[PDB]
Enzyme design. Sequence first.
Site, PDB file in Angstrom:
ATOM      1  N   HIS A   1     -33.054  19.328 -31.333  1.00  0.00           N
ATOM      2  CA  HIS A   1     -32.013  20.134 -30.695  1.00  0.00           C
ATOM      3  C   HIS A   1     -30.640  19.722 -31.228  1.00  0.00           C
ATOM      4  O   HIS A   1     -30.241  18.561 -31.095  1.00  0.00           O
ATOM      5  CB  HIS A   1     -32.063  20.019 -29.168  1.00  0.00           C
ATOM      6  CG  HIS A   1     -31.193  21.017 -28.471  1.00  0.00           C
ATOM      7  ND1 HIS A   1     -31.694  22.159 -27.886  1.00  0.00           N
ATOM      8  CD2 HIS A   1     -29.849  21.066 -28.304  1.00  0.00           C
ATOM      9  CE1 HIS A   1     -30.699  22.860 -27.370  1.00  0.00           C
ATOM     10  NE2 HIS A   1     -29.568  22.218 -27.612  1.00  0.00           N
ATOM     11  N   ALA A   2     -29.938  20.684 -31.830  1.00  0.00           N
ATOM     12  CA  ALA A   2     -28.704  20.440 -32.588  1.00  0.00           C
ATOM     13  C   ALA A   2     -27.592  19.838 -31.734  1.00  0.00           C
ATOM     14  O   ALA A   2     -27.399  20.249 -30.589  1.00  0.00           O
ATOM     15  CB  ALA A   2     -28.224  21.731 -33.245  1.00  0.00           C
TER      16      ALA A   2
ATOM     17  N   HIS B   1     -20.742  26.415 -34.622  1.00  0.00           N
ATOM     18  CA  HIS B   1     -20.600  25.889 -33.264  1.00  0.00           C
ATOM     19  C   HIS B   1     -20.446  24.370 -33.270  1.00  0.00           C
ATOM     20  O   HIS B   1     -19.508  23.829 -32.674  1.00  0.00           O
ATOM     21  CB  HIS B   1     -21.792  26.265 -32.369  1.00  0.00           C
ATOM     22  CG  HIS B   1     -21.707  25.669 -30.997  1.00  0.00           C
ATOM     23  ND1 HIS B   1     -21.008  26.269 -29.973  1.00  0.00           N
ATOM     24  CD2 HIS B   1     -22.188  24.507 -30.493  1.00  0.00           C
ATOM     25  CE1 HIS B   1     -21.080  25.517 -28.890  1.00  0.00           C
ATOM     26  NE2 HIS B   1     -21.786  24.439 -29.179  1.00  0.00           N
ATOM     27  N   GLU B   2     -21.379  23.696 -33.936  1.00  0.00           N
ATOM     28  CA  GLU B   2     -21.409  22.237 -33.987  1.00  0.00           C
ATOM     29  C   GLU B   2     -20.185  21.663 -34.706  1.00  0.00           C
ATOM     30  O   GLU B   2     -19.674  20.609 -34.318  1.00  0.00           O
ATOM     31  CB  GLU B   2     -22.708  21.739 -34.635  1.00  0.00           C
ATOM     32  CG  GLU B   2     -23.998  22.155 -33.910  1.00  0.00           C
ATOM     33  CD  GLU B   2     -24.110  21.599 -32.492  1.00  0.00           C
ATOM     34  OE1 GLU B   2     -23.454  20.577 -32.184  1.00  0.00           O
ATOM     35  OE2 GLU B   2     -24.866  22.189 -31.687  1.00  0.00           O
TER      36      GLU B   2
ATOM     37  N   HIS C   1     -17.178  21.338 -32.429  1.00  0.00           N
ATOM     38  CA  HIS C   1     -17.155  20.046 -31.742  1.00  0.00           C
ATOM     39  C   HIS C   1     -16.519  18.972 -32.627  1.00  0.00           C
ATOM     40  O   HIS C   1     -15.618  18.257 -32.187  1.00  0.00           O
ATOM     41  CB  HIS C   1     -18.566  19.606 -31.349  1.00  0.00           C
ATOM     42  CG  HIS C   1     -19.164  20.391 -30.222  1.00  0.00           C
ATOM     43  ND1 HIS C   1     -18.576  20.475 -28.977  1.00  0.00           N
ATOM     44  CD2 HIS C   1     -20.318  21.093 -30.140  1.00  0.00           C
ATOM     45  CE1 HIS C   1     -19.336  21.210 -28.182  1.00  0.00           C
ATOM     46  NE2 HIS C   1     -20.398  21.598 -28.866  1.00  0.00           N
TER      47      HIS C   1
ATOM     48  N   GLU D   1     -17.053  23.694 -25.937  1.00  0.00           N
ATOM     49  CA  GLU D   1     -18.082  24.656 -26.333  1.00  0.00           C
ATOM     50  C   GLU D   1     -17.531  25.920 -27.003  1.00  0.00           C
ATOM     51  O   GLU D   1     -18.235  26.570 -27.782  1.00  0.00           O
ATOM     52  CB  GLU D   1     -18.964  25.029 -25.126  1.00  0.00           C
ATOM     53  CG  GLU D   1     -19.704  23.851 -24.498  1.00  0.00           C
ATOM     54  CD  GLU D   1     -20.484  23.030 -25.514  1.00  0.00           C
ATOM     55  OE1 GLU D   1     -20.927  23.595 -26.535  1.00  0.00           O
ATOM     56  OE2 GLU D   1     -20.662  21.820 -25.297  1.00  0.00           O
TER      57      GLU D   1
ATOM     58  N   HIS E   1     -31.587  21.322 -21.872  1.00  0.00           N
ATOM     59  CA  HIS E   1     -30.474  20.789 -21.085  1.00  0.00           C
ATOM     60  C   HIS E   1     -30.894  20.301 -19.714  1.00  0.00           C
ATOM     61  O   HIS E   1     -30.277  19.396 -19.158  1.00  0.00           O
ATOM     62  CB  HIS E   1     -29.379  21.845 -20.947  1.00  0.00           C
ATOM     63  CG  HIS E   1     -28.788  22.264 -22.254  1.00  0.00           C
ATOM     64  ND1 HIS E   1     -29.475  23.041 -23.160  1.00  0.00           N
ATOM     65  CD2 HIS E   1     -27.582  22.009 -22.813  1.00  0.00           C
ATOM     66  CE1 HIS E   1     -28.716  23.250 -24.220  1.00  0.00           C
ATOM     67  NE2 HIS E   1     -27.564  22.633 -24.036  1.00  0.00           N
TER      68      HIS E   1
ATOM     69  N   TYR F   1     -21.118  26.301 -20.803  1.00  0.00           N
ATOM     70  CA  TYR F   1     -21.433  27.436 -21.676  1.00  0.00           C
ATOM     71  C   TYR F   1     -21.023  28.779 -21.066  1.00  0.00           C
ATOM     72  O   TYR F   1     -20.648  29.693 -21.795  1.00  0.00           O
ATOM     73  CB  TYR F   1     -22.915  27.450 -22.070  1.00  0.00           C
ATOM     74  CG  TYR F   1     -23.362  26.190 -22.768  1.00  0.00           C
ATOM     75  CD1 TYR F   1     -22.951  25.904 -24.074  1.00  0.00           C
ATOM     76  CD2 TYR F   1     -24.183  25.276 -22.120  1.00  0.00           C
ATOM     77  CE1 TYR F   1     -23.362  24.734 -24.715  1.00  0.00           C
ATOM     78  CE2 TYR F   1     -24.590  24.107 -22.746  1.00  0.00           C
ATOM     79  CZ  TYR F   1     -24.177  23.843 -24.043  1.00  0.00           C
ATOM     80  OH  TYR F   1     -24.587  22.680 -24.654  1.00  0.00           O
TER      81      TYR F   1
HETATM   82  C1  LIG Z   1     -27.271  24.285 -30.014  1.00  0.00           C
HETATM   83  C2  LIG Z   1     -26.406  23.783 -28.843  1.00  0.00           C
HETATM   84  N1  LIG Z   1     -26.606  22.323 -28.709  1.00  0.00           N
HETATM   85  C3  LIG Z   1     -25.739  21.686 -27.695  1.00  0.00           C
HETATM   86  C4  LIG Z   1     -26.039  20.181 -27.622  1.00  0.00           C
HETATM   87  C5  LIG Z   1     -25.581  19.623 -26.272  1.00  0.00           C
HETATM   88  C6  LIG Z   1     -25.872  18.130 -26.070  1.00  0.00           C
HETATM   89  C7  LIG Z   1     -25.215  17.459 -25.033  1.00  0.00           C
HETATM   90  C8  LIG Z   1     -25.451  16.101 -24.818  1.00  0.00           C
HETATM   91  C9  LIG Z   1     -26.353  15.416 -25.638  1.00  0.00           C
HETATM   92  C10 LIG Z   1     -27.013  16.084 -26.672  1.00  0.00           C
HETATM   93  C11 LIG Z   1     -26.775  17.442 -26.882  1.00  0.00           C
HETATM   94  C12 LIG Z   1     -24.259  21.906 -28.037  1.00  0.00           C
HETATM   95  O1  LIG Z   1     -23.912  21.678 -29.211  1.00  0.00           O
HETATM   96  O2  LIG Z   1     -23.505  22.304 -27.117  1.00  0.00           O
HETATM   97  C13 LIG Z   1     -26.828  24.478 -27.538  1.00  0.00           C
HETATM   98  O3  LIG Z   1     -27.688  23.928 -26.851  1.00  0.00           O
HETATM   99  N2  LIG Z   1     -26.346  25.656 -27.086  1.00  0.00           N
HETATM  100  C14 LIG Z   1     -26.800  26.218 -25.786  1.00  0.00           C
HETATM  101  C15 LIG Z   1     -28.304  26.567 -25.822  1.00  0.00           C
HETATM  102  O4  LIG Z   1     -28.828  26.830 -26.928  1.00  0.00           O
HETATM  103  O5  LIG Z   1     -28.902  26.542 -24.735  1.00  0.00           O
HETATM  104  C16 LIG Z   1     -25.953  27.483 -25.560  1.00  0.00           C
HETATM  105  C17 LIG Z   1     -25.618  27.880 -26.988  1.00  0.00           C
HETATM  106  C18 LIG Z   1     -24.414  28.817 -27.112  1.00  0.00           C
HETATM  107  C19 LIG Z   1     -24.158  29.092 -28.608  1.00  0.00           C
HETATM  108  C20 LIG Z   1     -24.078  27.790 -29.455  1.00  0.00           C
HETATM  109  C21 LIG Z   1     -25.192  26.760 -29.134  1.00  0.00           C
HETATM  110  C22 LIG Z   1     -25.266  26.536 -27.615  1.00  0.00           C
HETATM  111 ZN   LIG Z   2     -21.842  22.734 -28.034  1.00  0.00          ZN
END
Ligand SMILES: C[C@H](N[C@@H](CCc1ccccc1)C(=O)O)C(=O)N1[C@H](C(=O)O)C[C@H]2CCCC[C@@H]21
Ligand SMILES: [Zn+2]
Length: 598
Positions: A321-322, A351-352, A355, A379, A481, A491
Amino acid sequence: ALVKEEIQAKEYLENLNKELAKRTNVETEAAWAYGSNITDENEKKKNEISAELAKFMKEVASDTTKFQWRSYQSEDLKRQFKALTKLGYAALPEDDYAELLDTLSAMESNFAKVKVCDYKDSTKCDLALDPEIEEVISKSRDHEELAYYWREFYDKAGTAVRSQFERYVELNTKAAKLNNFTSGAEAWLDEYEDDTFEQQLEDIFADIRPLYQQIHGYVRFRLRKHYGDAVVSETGPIPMHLLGNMWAQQWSEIADIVSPFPEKPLVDVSAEMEKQGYTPLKMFQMGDDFFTSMNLTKLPQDFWDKSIIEKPTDGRDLVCHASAWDFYLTDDVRIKQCTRVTQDQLFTVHHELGHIQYFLQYQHQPFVYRTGANPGFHEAVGDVLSLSVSTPKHLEKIGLLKDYVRDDEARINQLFLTALDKIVFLPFAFTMDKYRWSLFRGEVDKANWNCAFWKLRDEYSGIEPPVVRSEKDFDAPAKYHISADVEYLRYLVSFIIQFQFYKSACIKAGQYDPDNVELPLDNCDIYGSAAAGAAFHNMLSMGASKPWPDALEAFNGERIMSGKAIAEYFEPLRVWLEAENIKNNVHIGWTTSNKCVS
Ligand SMILES: C[C@H](N[C@@H](CCc1ccccc1)C(=O)O)C(=O)N1[C@H](C(=O)O)C[C@H]2CCCC[C@@H]21
Ligand SMILES: [Zn+2]
Ligand SMILES: *[C@@H]1O[C@H](CO)[C@@H](O[C@@H]2O[C@H](CO)[C@@H](O[C@@H]3O[C@H](CO[C@H]4O[C@H](CO)[C@@H](O)[C@H](O)[C@@H]4O)[C@@H](O)[C@H](O[C@H]4O[C@H](CO[C@@H]5O[C@H](CO)[C@@H](O)[C@H](O)[C@@H]5O)[C@@H](O)[C@H](O)[C@@H]4O)[C@@H]3O)[C@H](O)[C@H]2NC(C)=O)[C@H](O)[C@H]1NC(C)=O
Ligand SMILES: *[C@@H]1O[C@H](CO)[C@@H](O)[C@H](O)[C@H]1NC(C)=O
Ligand SMILES: *[C@@H]1O[C@H](CO)[C@@H](O)[C@H](O)[C@H]1NC(C)=O
């Protein structure tokens, strides 16, 4: 007296912030090692270092009571001290904190280690969510195959960790109360520094909800034509396994079967990316170029040296998970992404990198301010760029979209495609935290926890499981999550405020004029705009030094979270879709699901 103490307090904070940054670096390195390489040894290392940092935080929180900080003249010093009082989980007794850490790693590692058997070959049982299962969910149009992978994944990623999740809820609650919040819901909401924040979101969601209902109705209508009425009913919730996503959170993968004008172009650049020999490296280099083109900060050498941008080919378990990582030194920032060469992934890369840019912009701030203005701000950054990257305008510039005619019908296809992501996601995101808030607050009895999940997914999104579930199942942790204890409201906030940022960045770039037909918001490209970059620099460099309305004000002069901008973006779609649904006598709304047995 107070004048001499405030001078001493400033010196105290300066040293403590640097100490906290250094101690957090060590914790972050251990967390990174575990996420990159899941072993019993790395888990032990990660959790032992966290326990050490928590013990130090307790000492810090205790030390703040020796300063008369509430009496100080400096708003800045008071804000820093307040940040240091907020212990979170670190407020827990030593043994309870250790138990929580063990519980959290048990859930995240379970999620990361999920493997299922091939639908066609029960001998081959090494299919992971990323990439194997997600590939099937996004590509297959065999409803029984889709239903098989749904059941297998939810059983293994969700139900398997019920007892761990239960203990996590107990310990989360205990921690919140030790910080004198009512529950973990209030602890999460505290990050938004606004006691009317929930009501604000309810108000905004209520304004956008009717548009969601129209999209839902049309999609259901189109799915009936594809799968038949034996699979999809006119009046019931949509079977979620047909929506191209394991959690039905975004429906863009089924655009080819639900697009308003199937004879007109629909943007899908994955094939062209492959044809042009794109690699994960190239995708990240292109993201870097987008930021630098706006006069923002280039990615440092540590990023390229230390990031993981492809899934490892050895046998090891990891969290695919990215994610983006700040190591709290100087220029040590990293991404870990199991990157694939697709259009969807190109947006994820941006997106990443959003951050990462935020990390770079605020790294000069004191430690306590080295985070987003609020979790939604963090985000939103990369998504603003993704909105630009996704336009036919930008995609033609980079040679990924060829022979494209942007007539009125192509425009509707593109607006609909964007909505399948941006509007569809809103009720989903709201339900993730509505569910967990209800558990944290003690509003749902343990005997009702699973159907409480599916009830929310029904009420807000109008979707349901492909098979009958019951309280014997436990489906919430099948979402990353939820297993990883990551707050989700960020989000929902992001999807609202990113359109405020995008609209403003587009106006600043000269790319949007509401009175000019040649400059529509839905085809704005902010690439190369130093003016849009300036607004971003002004906002992001602040980190968490000021309450978030001041961070928004630094961007565009506004102080209020508003759904005006998202509604403005999709207004041409709303007008067309409302009329199209009337034209086709499309049923709107849904009956209560029968898919969770109480
Ligand atoms: C891929 C992305 N990964 C999350 C990773 C969040 C995270 C928090 C704490 C420890 C480890 C990981 C992020 O980068 O905010 C994500 O989960 N999502 C969420 C998802 O895929 O559920 C909502 C997506 C909206 C568009 C961009 C990607 C967003
Ligand atoms: Zn994010
Ligand atoms: C969450 O909320 C909790 C309350 O629900 C809160 O817990 C309270 O924290 C208080 C500390 O701020 C603490 O107050 C102390 O009480 C001591 C005696 O308490 C005993 O009896 C109680 C019943 O009567 C029992 O419940 C307790 O268990 C104890 O057995 C006092 O001895 C103590 O006093 C000293 O400190 C004050 C504070 O001084 C302040 O700072 C400067 C110092 O220079 C002063 O000039 C200034 O005026 C200011 O007052 C001194 O004034 C005094 O001279 C003593 O040195 C103190 O009052 C309280 O006991 C505790 N529990 C309860 C139930 O009230 C948590 O702290 C909150 N948690 C978070 C994270 O915020
Ligand atoms: C994973 O961790 C183990 C020990 O836990 C270590 O020996 C090994 O080198 C790591 N593997 C990789 C590929 O880094
Ligand atoms: C780039 O940013 C700097 C400050 O970071 C600013 O002074 C400069 O004007 C920007 N470049 C352009 C071309 O605007």
